[PDB]
Structures are given as C-alpha cells and as structure tokens.
Design a protein around this ligand. Structure first.
Ligand SMILES: [Zn+2]
Lengths: 262, 256, 175, 196, 202
C-alpha cells in the first residue's frame, strides 16, 4: 500500500534521530542492550516533529501501529542484524498527552472504536498466565523434511481465524511429528478495569472494560491498583451457529500499562 | 416504487412546514432545527405527530400503524434535508452523518395491562417508572464478511435495528459457512436495555405490579436512571409452543 | 447595525402599484411622485407601497424576478459556483419578506417563492461560515467578499470583526 | 498588604454590571485617603533619613510605597469615572428630570456634573439649525408609521398635547395617538406599544 | 443602542487606566523573589519576626507591584512564570485546546499571558505562540456554540470559557437573537431599555 509505504518512510525517518539530538537512537540501543522487544514512544515528540502522523495515529491506530512496528524492525536490523533475527516482530508502546482520548470506563462510548485511547481506573480481577501458540515447526520422519506454519486469532491485530492447527499428515499422508522445542509460544492474560469508586455517580453501578495483555505486559498489576492503560479499542464479533445476534462485546487491546500510585 | 414517493413526501414535509401567521411572521421549524443541531454536533431531531398529521394526514396514519419502514424513510429524508441545508461543509466533514428522528405526541397515554396482542407492530404510548438498567453495550449496524478459504469480501451489509440479527450466507459464491465477520470493518452504536414497571396507581388491588422490557439506542442511552417516572413512545414488537418474548423499541422519552 | 436599520435601507427600492384613488403629482424631497390615476401603474418607493397596501388603497404588482422559474435558475446557479453569485436585488430577503407578508393575495405562488429564497439564503450563509472559518484558520489579512448582500453580513458581523481584532492583537505583540 | 479597600470598592461596582448606579461609598474613600497619607508621611521620613544620614538601602522601600500610592490613585480615578459613565445614561433614558429614587443615590458633586452636562447638551441641541434645534434624544428607532396604538400601564395623571387638551392616563386604557408624541413615554415605561 | 458603555479592557501588553477588568486582572498574584531586601517592610510578612524582609526571600506579589518594581537590571525583583505557562502545560495545550477549562486555569488567560511578556525572559517567543495557537484552535467551537443555540440554557456552554471568550459568546448570541426576532416580526415594537426595567424591578 502506498499510504503504508509513506507512513513507514516517515516513521523510519522519525526513529533515526541520529544527526539531531540522539534520543530515539539511544533508546533503541538501550532496548537492544537490555534484551527487550518493546519501545515506549512518547507521541509528544511525534506531534512536535510530524503533527499529521500524530493525529492520524490517534484516529486510525491499526495501520499506523503496523507501519511503526515495521519501521522499528528495520532500524533494529540496521543497528544489529542478529538481534533482529532473534525476534520475529517488535512492539511499540505509547505515552504522553492524548487530548480528547483521555477517557474513563464510563465515557468510553462506541464512537471511539479503532482509536488509541488511555483509560484510567482500578483493577478488579486478573486471570492466569497461560501460553498461546504463534508458530509451530513440524517434522516428517519419512522424508526428513521440516514443515512450518503460522497461526492467528481474532484477539490480535491483523485478525484472522486460523484453523487446521497442528497438522499431522503430509501431502502424501506421511506421518508428521511436532517439535515442541522449536515452536514459538507467548503468554496471555485478561484483566478488568473499573471506574474509580469516588468518581462514580450514586445509585448507578460502576462501569467496566475488559483488556487483553500479552508478552511482557503480563503480571504488571494486581487487583486493587490504580492503573492507566493505553491501547486500541475494538469489538469482538460473536457468531452462534449460522446466526449473529449483532450485540458484539467490546475489548481493549493494550500496549502500555502504567501504575499511578506506585 | 411507492417507497420513493413516500420518501419524497417526507422530504417535502421537512422542507415546507412553517409556523406562524402573516400578522407576525413565518419561521420554518424543522429545517432550521436540523441545521442548528447538525452544526452543534447533535445529530437528532424531535418531530411531533400532530404537525405531520396537519401537513399530511395519510403520512401520519402510516406512522401509527407501520412504524418500521415509515420511520426508516423519515430518517433517510431527514439525512438528505440536513445534507442539503449545510451543503458547503468545512474541509474534512464532506461525509454526511446519519440523523435519528424522535417522535412525540399529545395523545392520552395507554396502560401496560391494556396492551393487547392486536396492537403488535404499532406505535404505543405507555407510562411507567424505571426500576432497572444495564451497561451500555455495542450494537452493529454495518458489517463486512470475508470467506475463510478464498478470502472473498462482501461489504456494507446492513443489519436491522432492534434485537434482530443477520443470518449469514451458506454458499461461498470453501466449505459450508466459510464467512467470518471482519472485526475492524464494523460500525457500531450505543445500546441499552431497561425495565419499565406499571405505575403505582394503575396496579389493581391485591396484585403485584407488572413489568416490560425496553430498548434504547444512540442518543436515547443514558437518559433515564432507575427511579424516574417516564412516558415512553415505542414500537411494540417480539424478539412453551410458539411463545415469543415481546419488547418495546423506544423512539421517544419524556422524563417527568 | 441592527436588522431594523438594514430593513430601513431596503424600504427605498422601486415597486409598481395600481392605485384606486386619484391624486396629482407629489413633489417629494427625494423625487417626483407620478400622477395617481386609478387602474394605472405608478412606481413608488417600497415604504409607500407597504403603507398604501396596509391602508387598502393600492394593489402591489410583483417584481420581475419573483418568478418560480427564475428563482429555480438562481438557486441552481448558487449551488454550483464555489464563490458568491450576483443576486437579482441587493435586498432580496427583505423584499421577499415584506411583500409576501403584507400582500400575498396579489402575488401568486407565494409559498414556492418563499421556499426557494430560503434555500438560496441557506446556501449563501453556509458559504459565509466557510469563509470565516478559512479566514481565521489561515491567519490571513484580507478577503474578497464579492456579491454579498448587507443582511448576510449583518448575520455574522460584530462577531467576525471583534474576533479578528483580538486575533490581530494576539498576533503582533512581540513586535 | 495594601490596596485591599480599593479593590473591594472596584469589585462592588463590577458586581452590578447592568448600570444600576449604587449608593456612594464614602467610608472606603476616607480609609484609602488615610492610608495614602500615612504612606506618604512614612515615605517622606524614610527619604529624609536616607538623604541626610546616608542610608542607601531605603530606596526599594520608597519605590514600593510610591507604587502603592499610584495604585491607590488609579483605583479612585476609575471608580469615579465609572459612576460618571453610569450617571450619563440617565439623561438619555429618563428624560430630563431625574426621578427622586435615582437622585437619592447620587452625590452633590455628581448632581452638579449632571446639571452642567444637561445644560451643555441643551445648548448644543439649540445650536443645531435655525430656531429650535433638532432634538437628538428623540427618534431613536427607524420610523414605520405615523399613528401607533398604545396602552397605559400605570396612572400618570393627565398628559397634554400641543393642541391644549390633556388625556387622562388611567391603567388599562388605549389611545390612537401619533408616534412622535408617545415615544418618550413608551421608553420611560408609562406606555406599551400594542401591535395588531 | 446600548445606554451604558463601560471602558473596554485593553488586550495585549498594554492595559487601560480606566478599565475595571484590567484593574482586577493585575490583582492576580505572581511568583517573585526579593533580590535586594526591603528594610522596614518585614511587617508585611506575618511569619517573619524581623522588621525588615531579608535578602533572597520569595513572595507571591501582585502583578501591578511586580510591574512597578521590575527593572531590566534585575536588582530589586525577579519574576518566575506561573505553572500554567511553563513547558509542561504548554505541551498539554498544544495537544488539544478544546478540552481544557480556561475558567479555572485563570479567569483572564489571554490577558495575563500577554502581560507576562513585559518581564523579559528567554521563553517569551514560545508563550506568545502558545497563546495565539490556543485562541486559533478554540475559535471554531466558540463560533458554532454561539451561532447555533436558540432558546436553550447556555450555562453549560460558557462554563469552560474565560472572559474574552464569554464576551465573544455574548456577541454571537446577540447577533443571532436579533435576526430571529426580525424574522418573527417582533423587531417593530418600541420597547423600553433593559436598564429602565431593571430599575423598575427595585
Ligand atoms: Zn471462499
């Protein structure tokens, strides 16, 4: 896509802050040295250097996030090829001032879907950290061939329902064996945020929003904490048999979890 | 078709209704209100029912008995009129937003215990007191589907308003039922459900009050909290053997 | 400048009336009033026509531009050009309001005339709002408002000028 | 610190934005004057001490007290001018003769200023054109008709016209008088314009 | 024809001597440091026991006093910017200007911000730019709110506007009501002024 290419070029130019004050060039080096794969990008700097990208990211988070991640991957590959080879895809987290996107679970309406928001509340429940499958590497003893496959689901960006998980037969029905040590797995956790009890109107029950954490964002907060989650807001379509009720639930993907009280 | 004629008649009603006498002056009431609301950012209008009857009695009579299609046509006419009144919009706002029409009338209110089964799919006006409410969930209006195998896309599918779904296609046009809803390509609106209780005086002796489920959408959400006396105008509709649950699609609220 | 004063400037246009009384020439300070012969046209200023019609002594003849076809053509032209367009009269709104409110039994098809004038007015007002927004956004210092009538200026005046004054004061302060 | 009374006096005026000339505040002005006099005496004493005995450290205190005195003068000047502005409109609204209610809230000097303003205005009116001049106060709206229907709102005795005949102004009575004779009465609040 | 015409406030770096609003804006306090001590003025500081204010103390003097005692030599007084005008709040304002509450931030935001330019500082070119961009960004919503609001309680729309924007709102509302009253044929009545009716209420 031409628009995606332009966004990638502009983001790669923004990240390579070398001949300017070396802020985000130093940050990438620090991330590589500390063996991480997520960079916290303050969007005040993006707004100061390129306002159009800042506004477009605040209003269309999906494509801009993808472009920013690919630009970060290219910059890391430029800095050190082996480190870029270790990790399939890098992640980007945001912070700063968002403007009208500073919402609460009560003022998070359905017109903000697909927009990068920053929700304030208090945690109420957290689930257990179970793994999830991303890539599985199979092997055929008969033909001495190593097969590979990629998976995806509806609770991730670039969502796609993928089936035929863990194949067991080749094209000619040859037996296939799964090598667990060569596959790639990632964590998964689900939380819930509630509007602050002091700022809730009397009589009415407080509101809530369900968020999804993954990879290094798991086990970052416990129930009873004042947090500030930042991420994209999206709907989860629900299909029952051959029918769809039309009343989809809403989820909030997360890319930066910050405590407040600390 | 007759749908186009009805839409044109609704547009003429919106563009040509005037109030006042020649001794003082005339002011168009709904065109000015549409312009003002659209410029303010509120995309709704409150159309009375005696005005529509005075302009065209047949049009009012087709709204008291077949509210669904006629209300949809009225909303489309309101959208077109609002688009033509503010035609040179500032840069970035070229696309025209959808307008929601709310109804109001001065008729004598009915009772919850007087709702027969003959008055199904008819506009009704029932008072009561709100005793419950739910969280504001999301309801889809435009959806796009995609095949799992051949990734064919069928976009801009419309979903009927109210508690009514959309039966997904079976043939791919690729096994049976290969279509899934694309998450990001969906337009959603607000959505809430209430519970209306019969008034404390209309309840007969030695009997507990009855209830009725309500449905609220878009700008009607978060308007009534539990414990308020309201007068509801809505469409009686359905959501044992052959038994179907019945709710009320609310199209107007007058908090007392 | 209130709307009453803008009307006061629109009550001096020329319209044709057909009197029923008889009167000789009147020498007014602003001109000579034609001989008043019953069942004979005589052009008079709009204020005199309004007074005579209110006193049941004349019969107002509609102006030439007050026709359905001409007004439809004007409305279609206005909704086509980006900038403003010339109008059949510099006081079309005041003339339409006064004539259609004080003498409607003489003018035929008054309702469609009033419906078309309103559409043209709405389009011109929207264009004016766009002009004001673009002026403030771009921090300009001059704008060419051609073919714009006095009432449409009065609609937004005393708000545009004061906003521009404050913006100019905030725009050159370090200098 | 200082200037508190002056700022309170200014706030009192600012509260009543829509004209409505309030009662004159004399005690506040007296206290401000006393504070100014005390500041001036202390400042002069400090100036002499720094002049003869060589105390260069007292200059900032002198600057401080001078600034306080300037602020105190500014507040009083603004307070007087705003009351003058409010008083002026009474000449253009309540005819020429001021009602006793408004006069009771006016100071003597303000009353003298009002009388002098009225005399100057009358002289300017007469200076315009020949014979009696053109009264600028009247004709404050575009004219539309010669005779207007009016209705009384209170008893005002009898109102006389140039013909030598008075009209008994009783509440809830209507007369079809010419416009140029009733505009001042309408603006004062004694009549109400009745439209068809 | 407005009968009472008070002196308008002067926007920019210059005030009006007879303006009441400018006489209240300068009353607002501003952080200051006493570079050279004020002898015999220690009675101003209630906590301080000495009769003379010591050198190096910090006080929140009013704007008029700071303007009067200021000198480019900076030997009698130094001025520190309020919190609202430093970089931290300037970036927030640059984010989005329609979400802030310029009635609680300061009743006179533009005027006080312009008056801050009298005191020399290396950040004036940024303060002026921030003020100008805030006005430019908040103009459109003020215009739309003022023009398109007929017969409706406006207390909810003017609760987050400072005094200059409130005056602009009043101008827009009086420019709309005049046209609406003209179209309805109520502009042909000779009516008493508001001042006369208010006096009659008393
Ligand atoms: Zn297919």
């Amino acid at each position: 896509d031409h628009e995606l290419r332009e966004a990638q070029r502009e983001y790669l130019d923004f990240l390579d802050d070398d001949q300017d004050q070396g802020l985000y060039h130093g940050k990438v080096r620090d991330m590589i040295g500390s063996n991480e794969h997520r960079l916290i990008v303050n969007l005040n700097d993006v707004r100061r250097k390129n306002d159009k990208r800042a506004n477009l990211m605040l209003n269309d988070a999906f494509a801009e996030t993808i472009a920013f991640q690919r630009a970060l991957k290219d910059l890391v590959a430029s800095i050190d090829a082996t480190y870029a080879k270790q990790f399939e895809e890098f992640s980007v987290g945001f912070e700063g001032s968002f403007g009208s996107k500073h919402v609460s679970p009560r003022t998070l309406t359905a017109s903000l879907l697909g927009s990068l928001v920053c929700v304030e509340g208090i945690v109420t429940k957290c689930s257990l950290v179970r793994p999830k499958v991303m890539r599985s590497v199979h092997y055929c003893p008969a033909t001495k061939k190593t097969l590979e496959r990629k998976y995806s689901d509806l609770t991730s960006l670039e969502a796609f329902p993928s089936s035929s998980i863990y194949p067991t037969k080749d094209e000619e029905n040859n037996p296939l064996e799964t090598e667990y040590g060569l596959s790639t797995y990632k964590d998964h956790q689900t939380l819930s945020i509630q509007e602050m009890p002091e700022k809730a109107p009397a009589g009415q029950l407080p509101r809530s929003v369900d968020i999804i954490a993954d990879d290094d964002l798991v086990d970052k907060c416990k129930p009873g904490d004042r947090v500030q989650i930042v991420g994209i807001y999206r709907c989860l379509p629900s299909k029952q048999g051959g029918f769809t009720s039309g009343t989809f639930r809403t989820i909030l993907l997360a890319n930066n979890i910050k405590l407040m009280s600390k | 078709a007759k749908k186009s004629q009805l839409k044109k008649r609704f547009r003429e009603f919106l563009r040509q209704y005037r109030i006042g006498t020649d001794r003082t002056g005339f002011t168009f009431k709904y065109r000015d209100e549409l312009k003002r609301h659209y410029n303010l950012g509120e995309y709704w209008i409150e159309v009375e029912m005696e005005d529509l009857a005075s302009f065209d009695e047949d049009l009012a009579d087709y709204l008291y008995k077949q509210p669904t299609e006629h209300l949809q046509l009225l909303e489309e006419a309101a959208q077109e009129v609002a688009d033509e009144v503010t035609r040179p919009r500032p840069a970035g706002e070229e696309t025209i937003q959808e307008i929601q029409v709310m109804l109001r009338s001065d008729a004598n209110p009915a009772n919850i215990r007087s709702l027969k089964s003959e008055q199904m799919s008819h506009l009704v006006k029932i008072p009561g007191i709100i005793i419950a409410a739910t969280a504001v969930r999301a309801k889809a209006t435009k959806i796009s589907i995609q095949c799992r195998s051949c990734r064919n896309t069928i976009g801009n599918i419309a979903v009927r308003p109210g508690l009514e779904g959309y039966a997904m296609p079976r043939k791919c046009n690729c096994p049976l039922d290969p279509y899934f809803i694309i998450p990001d390509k969906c337009k959603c609106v607000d959505f809430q459900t209430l519970k209306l209780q019969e008034s404390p005086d209309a309840v007969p002796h030695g009997e507990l009050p009855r209830h009725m489920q309500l449905y609220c959408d878009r700008y009607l959400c978060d308007k009534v909290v539990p414990g308020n006396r309201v007068t509801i105008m809505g469409i009686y509709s359905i959501r044992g053997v052959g038994i179907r649950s019945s709710y009320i699609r609310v199209v107007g609220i007058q908090v007392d | 400048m209130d709307a009453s004063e803008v009307e006061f400037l629109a009550e001096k246009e020329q319209v044709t009336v057909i009197p029923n009384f008889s009167l000789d020439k009147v020498y007014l300070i602003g001109g000579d009033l034609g001989p008043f012969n019953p069942s004979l046209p005589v052009e008079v200023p709009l204020w005199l026509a309004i007074n005579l019609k209110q006193r049941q002594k004349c019969r107002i003849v509609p102006p030439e531009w007050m026709d359905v076809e001409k007004l439809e053509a004007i409305r279609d032209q206005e909704r086509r050009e980006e900038t403003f367009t010339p109008m059949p009269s510099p006081y079309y709104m005041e003339l339409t309001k006064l004539l259609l409110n004080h003498a409607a039994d003489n003018i035929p098809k008054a309702d469609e005339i009033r419906t078309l004038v309103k559409d043209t007015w709405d389009t011109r007002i929207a264009k004016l709002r766009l002009s004001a927004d673009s002026f403030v956004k771009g921090q300009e210092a001059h704008a060419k408002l051609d073919n714009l009538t006095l009432m449409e200026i009065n609609t937004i005046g005393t708000f545009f000028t004061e906003s521009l004054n404050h913006m100019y004061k905030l725009r050159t302060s370090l200098q | 610190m200082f200037c508190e009374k002056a700022i309170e006096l200014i706030r009192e005026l600012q509260r009543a934005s829509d004209g409505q000339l309030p009662a004159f505040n004399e005690d506040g002005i007296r206290q401000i004057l006393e504070e100014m006099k005390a500041l001036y005496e202390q400042n002069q004493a400090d100036v002499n001490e720094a002049k003869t005995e060589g105390r260069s450290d007292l200059i900032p205190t002198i600057k401080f007290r001078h600034c306080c005195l300037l602020r105190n003068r500014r507040c009083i000047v603004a307070y007087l001018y705003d009351r003058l502005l409010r008083i002026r409109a009474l000449r253009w609204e309540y005819g020429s003769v001021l009602p006793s209610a408004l006069r009771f809230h006016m100071s003597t000097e303000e009353m003298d200023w009002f009388n002098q303003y009225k005399r100057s205005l009358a002289t300017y009116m007469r200076s315009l054109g020949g014979e009696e001049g053109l009264d600028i106060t009247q004709d404050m709206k575009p004219p539309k008709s010669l005779y207007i229907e009016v209705r009384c709102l209170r008893d005002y005795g009898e109102f006389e016209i140039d013909d030598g005949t008075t009209i008994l102004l009783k509440k809830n009575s209507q007369h079809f008088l010419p416009r140029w004779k009733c505009e001042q009465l309408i603006r004062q609040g004694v009549l109400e314009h009745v439209l068809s | 024809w407005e009968p009472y015409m008070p002196v308008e406030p002067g926007l920019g770096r210059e005030e009006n001597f007879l303006s009441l609003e400018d006489l209240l804006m300068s009353q607002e306090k501003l952080p200051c440091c006493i570079e050279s001590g004020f002898p015999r003025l220690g009675f101003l500081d209630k906590g301080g026991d000495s009769d003379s204010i010591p050198e190096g103390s910090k006080m929140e003097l009013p704007l008029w006093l700071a303007k009067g005692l200021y000198d480019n030599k900076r030997r009698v007084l130094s001025v520190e910017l309020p919190k609202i005008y430093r970089e931290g709040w300037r970036t927030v304002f640059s984010a989005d200007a329609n979400v802030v509450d310029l009635h609680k931030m300061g009743p006179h935001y533009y005027g006080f911000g312009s008056q801050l330019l009298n005191f020399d500082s290396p950040e004036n070119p940024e303060i002026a730019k921030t003020i100008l961009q805030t006005f430019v960004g908040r103009f459109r919503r003020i215009m739309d709110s003022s023009q398109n609001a007929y017969n409706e309680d406006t207390s909810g729309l003017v609760a987050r506007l400072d005094e200059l924007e409130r005056s602009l709102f009043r101008a827009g509302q009086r420019g709309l009501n005049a046209f609406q009253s003209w179209e309805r044929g109520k502009a042909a009545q000779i009516t008493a002024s508001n001042l006369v009716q208010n006096y009659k209420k008393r």
